[PDB]
């Protein structure tokens, strides 16, 4: 009866200040929530690398997009190993699955390994995106959702309670989103979610117990469905 | 001389004549002949489908979940990729098969480095096994490869159809916005989004016709441009 | 628990040219393997004739190194299809490939075979030896010796066993009489491999319903090849 | 030319200006410009640290065991390695990233063959991910890479300090500055120019140190021309 | 020593040089010697988490490298291959005694051996497998002793059993026996217990040595029970 | 393709006595011959490991066949790197191609890598057999000959001039060797050679300049064909 979910966790969720790329209280709070959630759900985590690497630094370094996205993928691996460590301390059975092969550090994602991880009911930490440039964290979240047969992506926003207009939305269609010219995710991720019937649960991730609370429908959130 | 970069999307059906053989030698050789000529003026990336070997309908019959079904399709593209490479080798075209899935005994792996290296050598790049991920179409892979190689245009070969219609009125030029508004199925929504985000144009034409790929680059027949 | 190799040619998985793999045929195969796996340690060696043949290689002017590579990718496709069919029957199974391709299959090795035997998984051997100039029969012989299987089930498509030529049915023949009589049970390489390592053949008609189960219970017409 | 072989140890701090960005483009481009000029006279091996991205203090905060902590550090050096390669490619320097950990989609693997091949081609070798093993420092890896490439000297760039002193200069306005010191004198005084393991590796294989201030403009080029204040550690 | 129990076992590294596996020149590996070793490891593995670090001297030595005009990078590579051969032989011997065992290699070679990594070591310890460490560090300029130190630190083993071929422990004919020496006392007395690098690594990570005669029957079992003549090296 | 040859070099060719697994004078003499030969031929070398590992030691160690053949494969890699070193000192362009992947030591054999090595006209040193148990050095020699499109295998014997009936045939047929019951190669290697029209050139390899001489038809040798 365990239903499957993808939690999109951007890099900003792991960082407090510029002094440290990863903040221990923020990542441990995250781990604590995942611990509780993993009792009722099969959990897939899709991480960003914005705390370590951003598009702005790529421009400063005159870095072409192929290489820039590669840097981002490495950043997600660092975050992935940090989250795994935090979850291991809580005795949560967890596995880091990477789109890029690097056996000394992480396991490789594949149809077999995902299936294997689901049977063991491991928390799946997905890293290095798709192993391809020109993908966003959101697009990877879409692909991972379809791949793991998760019908919903929890889309944590940093500061924002859900879909607004920079009036709140309790619920919104994908159609009504694109007619209203709202940038909930990039166009590619939107298309991916629509094609494979994946819903979004947009909420404020900065709030204490945010992820636990929105699965209990406790706070302000937006659902983006067909 | 001086070469601009193009992606040619070649579906599985372009390589197959009838059900007796998954790959037809005349069709693949004709394709290789055209690529030979084109590679003198362009840096050529080929993105192959596997429809001649593997289809979505067979996956249903075998009660095959999507993760596995798309993996079968990826292996199909590798077979096609090696066949095309062989045909191009016979014409002394410098060529390399770059795979999204690692398989050293058969193919080279696609990567930032290997693509860059193949471009410098001006090799025809045969891209194979899609993105290595399920839930992607050949069109989406074409978009990703175009962005990755900095190709501004994808030649979208259609089997039988001259371009973009509405069923029967012919368009010479349409916008991506104009496309999905008229509920036209040029590519899947994901591929469309990818092309728009990265300013990649489509050149839709009939690929079944003799010398079709060569002729559309010389603007000689009926075709449709899709831009922003 | 006795160890066996079942040689399954590509034609066993195909009905007609419209589809490379037929769901009824592969499901029937899986059903039989399911039952057999309760009494035997099962190794499956697959061909790729349903997808790729020697005749297409000639048409494409394809040299042998590449042609055999095409065939090996064909067996992987078949291997993943059969694994899927067996998974739906809750049979513990693993695809072991002679060619490394981690995103799709596991690699065959001394360790992984040993590990698969301990777990009593059905072993689906794929991509031959990873080398050109090998037949499916030769791979079956190597896999038999490697798994310490004393017998290869040699499924033929249409033929009840070994005859004079196709009519006298042989109940039992020797590999020595499988060249002396000018017959062609397997290629010479596979024959030598089997003799070298004391591997016997059980030649039977695999097209018949329940054929694999029946021959292990000695129920139908079959030929023993030994000595 | 008959190029002599050198290892340049570049810590993470050399690539970072402030906390807003892990890698600063001016600092890394300045480094690349110097390596460009140096590579005309020398076969250059670069050994990078990852302190701009990852440090030991973060590992403690995250309650991270040492095996995992050092793995984070190795991934950090790969990021730095790819950024430096990019900077050098823009200056048309033939360069290769050689990693102690296999990761084909991003880097080449270091091996006896690949090093030999890179030396013949006279590429700048950017060594990355240390030894692929925990319990090694950047210094230790620099020693190993020096021995492996048959480099007789390691340029040991320090951030702010001009070289080896008998004590911290920031405190004592009376600290001796050594233009040359032996490993022997340095250990009886208990100076820790490098960690004990790196020191032992250098002594075992007759590798010398050239300690200097890396923050100064043109520092690496100048020290090879013997132009500024530097400490040679030898014997 | 360490003297542990059946649950929550202490972790040890046993350094087994190539000479322990060879009787004479007619065969590189002697079945009696390797089976005796396996028998001891079987008994020891009941009370300890056991890591074995093997040398390759029975197959390859430094002297052959000189004869073949072989540079160090390649020479050490030959040695690493030798340890893999030894590793597979010991694993076979241990498998016949039904000891759960795994060969972990610093060099990737999937058809022969498993790769060592933080994850695989952790996984092997959980399963309480005997870990046979092979191919050193995958790098040249390391001795078997230095690999033993690195493996000890990596596995969090507090002690390395240093089997010597012929000698009961540490001495200065009729020499004086040391029951205990410091690492300081080790170098300061010119006593070559291990190479300088291995010594440094052990000091840095607080790893002790247990030096004993490995040629004697039941030697490894007996020194863990404190039964014979042996030397502790420690801080 | 025709002017390509396979030279089968057993382990015994590299060893003088038990004190050293590899003898420098024997291996250097072999290297000198290969140097001269590689000017006129595309050379594939198939090495055995009998100088380091043999079947008799496997029995003593109670070693199952799968593991025993694995030991032998690692032995050939050691020999392969030794021969490469000897050829490098003579400035011969050479590459070690292994049936088993081990990137830190050797390159992997494949259709692409063989093709690439042939175009470069490198001496190919084939190592680790087929990567499979139940193969002999002779069988590997057959497979490499067919793979490289070599029409002939130089079958160096240690002590014997050619094909007798033990202590002389100048030309034997394959079928004749079977009727006569001669042990030229194991049955599998014989079948492989016949299937792919590969000839054998059996000669005494212990003799000075033996390999060079037999290609110039200079000494006593047996030619095997069908």
CSV table of N, CA and C in Angstrom, one decimal, chain A residues 9-17 20-24 26-27 30 47-49 51 79-80 82-83 158:
chain,number,residue,atom,x,y,z
A,9,UNK,N,14.5,18.7,-4.0
A,9,UNK,CA,15.2,19.5,-3.0
A,9,UNK,C,16.3,20.3,-3.7
A,10,UNK,N,16.1,21.6,-3.9
A,10,UNK,CA,17.0,22.5,-4.5
A,10,UNK,C,18.3,22.7,-3.6
A,11,UNK,N,19.4,23.1,-4.1
A,11,UNK,CA,20.6,23.4,-3.4
A,11,UNK,C,20.4,24.3,-2.2
A,12,UNK,N,19.6,25.4,-2.4
A,12,UNK,CA,19.4,26.4,-1.4
A,12,UNK,C,18.8,25.8,-0.1
A,13,UNK,N,18.1,24.7,-0.2
A,13,UNK,CA,17.6,24.0,1.0
A,13,UNK,C,18.7,23.5,2.0
A,14,UNK,N,19.9,23.4,1.5
A,14,UNK,CA,21.0,22.7,2.2
A,14,UNK,C,22.0,23.8,2.7
A,15,UNK,N,21.8,25.0,2.3
A,15,UNK,CA,22.7,26.1,2.6
A,15,UNK,C,22.1,27.2,3.4
A,16,UNK,N,22.8,27.7,4.5
A,16,UNK,CA,22.3,28.8,5.3
A,16,UNK,C,23.0,30.1,4.8
A,17,UNK,N,24.3,30.1,4.7
A,17,UNK,CA,25.1,31.2,4.5
A,17,UNK,C,26.3,30.9,3.6
A,20,UNK,N,29.6,28.3,4.5
A,20,UNK,CA,29.6,26.8,4.3
A,20,UNK,C,28.6,26.4,3.2
A,21,UNK,N,29.0,25.6,2.3
A,21,UNK,CA,28.2,25.1,1.2
A,21,UNK,C,27.0,24.2,1.6
A,22,UNK,N,27.2,23.5,2.7
A,22,UNK,CA,26.2,22.7,3.4
A,22,UNK,C,26.1,23.0,4.8
A,23,UNK,N,24.9,23.3,5.3
A,23,UNK,CA,24.6,23.6,6.7
A,23,UNK,C,24.0,22.4,7.4
A,24,UNK,N,24.6,22.0,8.5
A,24,UNK,CA,24.3,20.8,9.2
A,24,UNK,C,22.9,20.7,9.8
A,26,UNK,N,20.1,22.5,8.7
A,26,UNK,CA,19.2,22.4,7.6
A,26,UNK,C,19.1,21.0,7.0
A,27,UNK,N,20.3,20.3,6.8
A,27,UNK,CA,20.3,19.0,6.2
A,27,UNK,C,19.9,17.9,7.2
A,30,UNK,N,16.1,18.2,7.3
A,30,UNK,CA,15.6,17.5,6.1
A,30,UNK,C,15.6,16.0,6.3
A,47,UNK,N,18.0,16.0,-6.0
A,47,UNK,CA,18.7,17.1,-5.5
A,47,UNK,C,19.3,18.1,-6.6
A,48,UNK,N,19.3,19.4,-6.3
A,48,UNK,CA,20.0,20.4,-7.1
A,48,UNK,C,21.3,20.7,-6.5
A,49,UNK,N,22.1,21.5,-7.2
A,49,UNK,CA,23.5,21.8,-6.8
A,49,UNK,C,23.8,23.3,-6.7
A,51,UNK,N,23.7,25.4,-4.3
A,51,UNK,CA,24.5,25.7,-3.1
A,51,UNK,C,26.0,25.7,-3.4
A,79,UNK,N,26.2,16.8,-2.6
A,79,UNK,CA,25.0,17.0,-1.8
A,79,UNK,C,24.3,15.6,-1.5
A,80,UNK,N,24.3,14.8,-2.5
A,80,UNK,CA,23.7,13.4,-2.3
A,80,UNK,C,24.4,12.6,-1.3
A,82,UNK,N,26.2,13.8,1.2
A,82,UNK,CA,25.9,14.5,2.5
A,82,UNK,C,24.6,14.1,3.1
A,83,UNK,N,23.5,14.1,2.3
A,83,UNK,CA,22.2,13.7,2.7
A,83,UNK,C,22.2,12.2,3.1
A,158,UNK,N,11.6,28.1,-1.9
A,158,UNK,CA,12.3,28.8,-0.8
A,158,UNK,C,11.7,30.2,-0.6
